[PDB]
């Protein structure tokens, strides 16, 4: 039969592929660039906008916009360009012919699912569509029916307690720190050492520094005193032009804002205390099964040492005899896509799709009725 397309609109990356594949066929940054300089050479072949890896390659010439921030789609013409690029250029597939399982972060505005449906049926004319909560898919991806999924993207962080296949929607925490606010903090702190990164293209050097060199301290104050007292933590990286830059205690300081959002001036508690505060909203019979099965998900959890710091710092909160376990598979970056791939291939699922007949009858409001 025709496979479904499975497509996950992160804030940072698009992952797309076919249902039943074990890993996504297209991953590229969900970024749209436009040229910002005078076109001097005649006949070069101008282009109004680049998308994805095209915009990465040219990025010295371009202003780079992200069209999703904080899991909300903030201008639609760009997002429609990104989907056009996903179906026609990366997957090379007619969207006329395959169901599409889309994906969304919980608790975000309802006008985002309405538009995201309207564009699939009117613009791409997809036969049938669905929209699925990100954190639900990571349990399909990790073989579990019970757990509390901590999922952190480029734009949003959320906890979703799931016990025996029932979500507990009153206990869902959403927290608005993510990889992009880590990157903006990293630029601000790097300025202390004299390195200044200003532009949107130059931000995306800092993002690569963050990915390569940051790590999470197992005791923030002890490593602060260490790196204040020794060169041993100091490590160095090459900018694209060959300048070398050298980075010290600062490289652990930026992911610490996940555990101390006050560094960004964020009033809320860190990911550990929102996880514990999520388990404390669940019924006491199930907390023992949510203290095991803490599932990490999404790229912002890829930092070295984040699983150990989580286990340590929840174990300081939970009662002394609950077995705290953090589950952090090495593919957790793709785990939301892998779980979407599983979900779209089940035969019990094939009744769940929103078929175009139903969208014609009901209009886009149907997405709230026929979906979580």
């Amino acid at each position: 039969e025709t496979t479904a397309l499975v497509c996950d609109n992160g804030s940072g990356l698009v992952k797309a592929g076919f249902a039943g594949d074990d890993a996504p066929r297209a991953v590229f940054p969900s970024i749209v660039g436009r040229p910002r300089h005078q076109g001097v050479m005649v006949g070069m072949g101008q282009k109004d906008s680049y998308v994805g890896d095209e915009a990465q390659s040219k990025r010295g010439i371009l202003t780079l916009k992200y069209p999703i921030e904080h899991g909300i789609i903030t201008n639609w013409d760009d997002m429609e360009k990104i989907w056009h690029h996903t179906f026609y250029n990366e997957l090379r597939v007619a969207p006329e012919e395959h169901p599409t399982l889309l994906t969304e972060a919980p608790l975000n505005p309802k006008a985002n699912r309405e538009k995201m449906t309207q564009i699939m049926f009117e613009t791409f004319n997809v036969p049938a569509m669905y929209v699925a909560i990100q954190a639900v898919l990571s349990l399909y991806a990790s073989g579990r029916t019970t757990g509390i999924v901590l999922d952190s993207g480029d734009g949003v962080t959320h906890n979703v307690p799931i016990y025996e296949g029932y979500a507990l929607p009153h206990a869902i925490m959403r927290l608005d720190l993510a990889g992009r606010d880590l990157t903006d903090y990293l630029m601000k702190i790097l300025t202390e050492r004299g390195y200044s990164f200003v532009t949107t293209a130059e931000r995306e050097i800092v993002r690569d520094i963050k990915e390569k060199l940051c790590y999470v301290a197992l005791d923030f104050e002890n490593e602060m005193a260490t790196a204040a007292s020794s060169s041993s933590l100091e490590k160095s990286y090459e900018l694209p032009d060959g300048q070398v830059i050298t980075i010290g205690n600062e490289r652990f300081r930026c992911p610490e804002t996940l555990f101390q959002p006050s560094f960004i001036g964020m009033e809320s508690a860190g990911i550990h205390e929102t996880t514990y505060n999520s388990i404390m909203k669940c019924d006491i019979d199930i907390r023992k099964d949510l203290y095991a099965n803490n599932v990490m998900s999404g790229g912002t959890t890829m930092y070295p040492g984040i699983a150990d710091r989580m286990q340590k710092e929840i174990t300081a909160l939970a009662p002394s005899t609950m077995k705290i376990k953090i589950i952090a598979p090495p593919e957790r970056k793709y785990s939301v896509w892998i779980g979407g791939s599983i979900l779209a291939s089940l035969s019990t699922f094939q009744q769940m799709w929103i078929t175009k007949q139903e969208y014609d009858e009901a209009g886009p409001s149907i997405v709230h009725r026929k979906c979580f």
């Binding site: 921030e69 903030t74 505005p109 608005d176």
Partner: peptide, 7 residues
């Protein structure tokens, strides 16, 4: 967003 934040 539409109120509490920039998006």
């Amino acid at each position: 967003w539409x109120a509490x934040c920039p998006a």
